[PDB]
């Protein structure tokens, strides 16, 4: 297991405040099998795409 | 999977039975123009620390919130205090038996 | 006698051995509420051997008759009248940091007077006031009458 | 964490499910050691009393009054207790020393430290015998010197004279043979120090209790070697030649046999320390009805017509001398 | 009169305290008020009764988790086991599980036998105390109270009896030059049954063993002696 | 998920009953079995994902 600690990146575009950070992939072999795990943020909401698609 | 943006301890999200042992972790590159803006703005700060089998302490308050946690593995004050069911133990001479030398390299029984 | 191994020989060079078993396990530690650090004691083991086992401790070593006491300066000049963290053999540690002071529970008042019959007479410090004091004591005579359904 | 399982992590996992029971055993050990230390402080403050002695004391200059010798029992460490410490070498100081020899070298037959290497440790008592012997010496010289706090403010020869008043003996023949009866006590003291060369009943019970303690320790030593229905007795070979699931029944049968052995031993220890408490309290009673002040209770301090008594420090007890 | 005759046996004269009965009565009620306020402080006796009630409370609490230990069995709740396994598959663990329960029970009653034996002996010791120095006063020192124990009174306690004690301990002393035992010109010894002898103003006076009071010498405060020893003080005339 | 969860075996049809309070009955609360008494109380410390209280 691993532990992460992410400070929010509050970048303030003029009258549109954002807080966006990077994208992490975890898995075993990262192929069209073995249930690859990709989670990404999109401006205030997280998008988990945890499926065994190609990399 | 666990996250908590609000509140310093983390909470449950979902479980995921796979069976396949998970082996590697990687952070994607983000093709972005300038998040630093000639090193005058913010940057990316993913920090990582691995996990393994440990026994800890979970202190609950009156509202069921994790108050403190004790490692019971790093220091000698990490033990004793957590085995005495307190954040702060009473005075006393408490024995320790949490060390074994194990420097061996050959173990065989033969004729 | 009780099936306990002692030693062997090699079949090559025909030389014998004495298999003394090794040591494992720590000893103890000491803690106080108003203190924040720890007092460590490693009895029946050499301080230099302890430092040669793994590494060198942050606190300096202090070898005693009992053993290797850590994070506590040994101070046999003063004597603690009443201690609560007993190291054994009249020894104790306390926080003001942690230091080692020898313990004795009681002492005799050592009245500055003579010892022999001065002119056939003796110098005795006899009382001159009358004073009483109550004394509190408890003896347990009863226990709660527990039972259990089998 | 060391005895029933030494260092094996798969074994310690099966120890971890039932570690509450051995933790309860450890708490039982903690409270019986608490009663041991409590009775030791009880011994300490019952031997202590309202004692005042003159601070200008020298044991080597002034050491005898009216020609009775005390240099065997005069300490500060007396020769009288050091003779008994010469008669038996298994003192707690000797135990600490025996732990100090077992750090590498010779004497491969070293049972005390391989007991410690197997797990069982004879802890030293919280009071050294040097300060206890000094306390007994201080009480004795308080009984022998003014002010006689341990003799109710009465000189020692006057204690003998006033006691022999109360035992049906007149004073007419007594007033001309104070030196003769003083030499009678001197010859009695020489006889009772010379009797220790022969195997006495006191020697019989002190080596009996220390050999009983050693026999109980050796009984714990063979309990590791007992099968308890298993195909072996230790953990390494059954972790090696078995696959830990067919060996799991062997593991839990050996640990429950060992835990029942510890239950029997802690029952024996609580019975033993109850006996220690009763014997200790009877010792308190006879101390404060003989040496601090004699009492009119016949045939308990000494068989026959009792006169006076003295108490000397002993290994794991007190030595009581009665006249 | 009982306490006045009682402290006479500890070596106190009566002439001084005939004028001082009022202040020792205030000492009595002040000692009772002090020990009554002594329970406000966490003293030993409150610690002792709290230790007793916490000890057997922790014993009966430790009885509860013996149901909840893992043992060799796959769980500790037999209800979900019998709602999880059949009756034939119950006995492969439940018989030695309840055997472990019964070993816990007979072990527990063995410590119950030990503690009831020691508290029976404590009741016997309390019996000895209350029939030797509560309903009477026995010549036996350092048994009911340390130092010069005067008398004791017993109050009721939960699961016990509270033993409060009157003891005598002075606050100030005085040095003096005295001699234990002497003899007279007729070769008759003079020795105190209690107390000492002071020589002042060219006469030999008598003092008690607990308070400095020069009393006139008499024949009732002294034990007689046929001949004095050669190492005793020689007093001329009568 | 022994005797706990959402996938219920309805091979033996049993109607869902209301919580009969203040009586000594046996319970089958979503497969959680046992026997005890329920008293209607008020609690505020419960959470969205949290549904059971343990001693
Ligand atoms: C992990 C690391 O060292 N990151 C660097 C990063 C990379 O070196 C580089 O950008 C990626 O491309 C390669 C493989 O050469 O560069 C950073 O500095 C840049 C220097 O290349 C910086 O000058 C960026 O340059 C641009 O010209 C570009 O597109 O490369 C424009 C861009 O706005 C600018 N970025 C700024 C000023 O933040 C970087 O990208 O920040 C320094 C990182 O530490
Ligand atoms: C009275 O007793 C004292 C104390 O014992 C005697 O003083 C010395 O006693 C020791 C031991 O008895 C003798 O070895 C010394 O020779 C004594 N010194 C002197 C100067 O005598 C003292 O002698 C006794 N006096 C009488 C009259 O018996
Ligand atoms: C010594 O060892 C050799 C082999 O190394 C062996 O053949 C021989 O019997 C041994 N004993 C003696 C006495 O040589
Ligand atoms: C520790 O600190 C508390 C709080 O100031 C104080 O009351 C107490 O006397 C201190 N010492 C000990 C030994 O508890
Ligand atoms: C403290 O210990 C050291 C060695 O551990 C010793 O040399 C020193 O004399 C001791 N100090 C005392 C006894 O005051
Ligand atoms: C004795 O002590 C008491 C204690 O207060 C004091 O009041 C008194 O003056 C002292 N002296 C006498 C002679 O009572
Ligand atoms: C301990 O035993 C060794 C080996 O016999 C010996 O050399 C050493 O002197 C002993 N220690 C003491 C303090 O006598
Ligand atoms: C399962 O069985 C129940 C009867 O206990 C029935 O009501 C239900 O329709 C069944 N589910 C199906 C057939 O999917």
Which short descriptors sum up this protein?
binds a molecule of 2 linked components (NAG-NAG); three-stranded antiparallel sheet; two-stranded antiparallel ribbon; 55 residues; 6 strands; mainly beta; part of a larger assembly; binds a molecule of 2 linked components (SIA-5N6); 6 chains; Spike protein S2' (chain E); binds 2-acetamido-2-deoxy-beta-D-glucopyranose
Could you explain how this protein is built, in words?
Chain A is 0% helix and 45% strand. Chain A has strands at residues 2-4, 10-13, 16-19, 23-27, 37-41, 46-49. In chain A, the strands form 2 sheets. Chain A has a 3-stranded antiparallel β-sheet with strand order 4-5-6, with no helix packed on it. Chains in contact: A-B, B-C, B-D, B-F, C-D, C-E, D-E, E-F. β8 (122-127) of chain C pairs antiparallel with β3 of chain E, so a sheet runs across the interface. The structure holds a molecule of 2 linked components (SIA-5N6), a molecule of 2 linked components (NAG-NAG) and 2-acetamido-2-deoxy-beta-D-glucopyranose (NAG) (6 copies). Residues 12, 14 of chain C line the site of one 2-acetamido-2-deoxy-beta-D-glucopyranose (NAG). One 2-acetamido-2-deoxy-beta-D-glucopyranose (NAG) is lined by residues 129, 131 of chain C.
